[PDB]
Amino acid sequence: ASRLYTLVLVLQPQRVLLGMKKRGFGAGRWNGFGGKVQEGETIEDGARRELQEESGLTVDALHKVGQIVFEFVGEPELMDVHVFCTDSIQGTPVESDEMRPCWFQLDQIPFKDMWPDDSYWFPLLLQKKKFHGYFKFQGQDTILDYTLREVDTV
Ligand SMILES: Fc1cnccc1-c1ccnc2[nH]ccc12
Numbered sequence: 001a002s003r004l005y006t007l008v009l010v011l012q013p014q015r016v017l018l019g020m021k022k023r024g025f026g027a028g029r030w031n032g033f034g035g036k037v038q039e040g041e042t043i044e045d046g047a048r049r050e051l052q053e054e055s056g057l058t059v060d061a062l063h064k065v066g067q068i069v070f071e072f073v074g075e076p077e078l079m080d081v082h083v084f085c086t087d088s089i090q091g092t093p094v095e096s097d098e099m100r101p102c103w104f105q106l107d108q109i110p111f112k113d114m115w116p117d118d119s120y121w122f123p124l125l126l127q128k129k130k131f132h133g134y135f136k137f138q139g140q141d142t143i144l145d146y147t148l149r150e151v152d153t154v
Helices: 043-055 118-126
Strands: 002-011 015-021 063-072 078-086 099-105 130-138 142-151
Touching: 002 043, 002 118, 015 043, 043 078, 043 099, 063 118, 078 118, 118 130, 118 142
Parallel strands: 002 078, 063 130
Antiparallel strands: 002 015, 015 099, 063 078, 130 142
8 A cells, every 4th residue: 555665864963965856756856865665675775775876875774764654645555755864975976867966054954945744854853853754745745634753663
């Protein structure tokens, strides 16, 4: 009933890396790096793979920080997004035809140009909290209803 996705935030003490997606689903918004998990791959391995594909960066250990389920009314499949963070990467962020990376100071996170749910859970990430969330959307701009709770085990 749900499809697995990953989302990785490279979050360091004073800055966070986001990428502006150029095409496809979510294009035109700043976000972390991620995508669909493949057959025979663990969620964390898929998170690591997608970070490389989309940003050019190599991460070793990833830390689980959240799970968010998205419902888009009128679409049957829920999107089960597993969120991870890291403070330690190798490589320089790469701009490609699919993605434009940029570092942001923590006070300048571009919420108006991000998915609207990020305004709810990104501040929990910044304060090193973990969470379970569920957001029901109509279209890509309107949150009809949501739940969001902090957890000790993701
Ligand atoms: F950007 C996506 C890509 N694939 C699946 C789900 C999302 C998504 C949907 C709604 N809000 C979001 N905030 C951060 C990611 C995200």
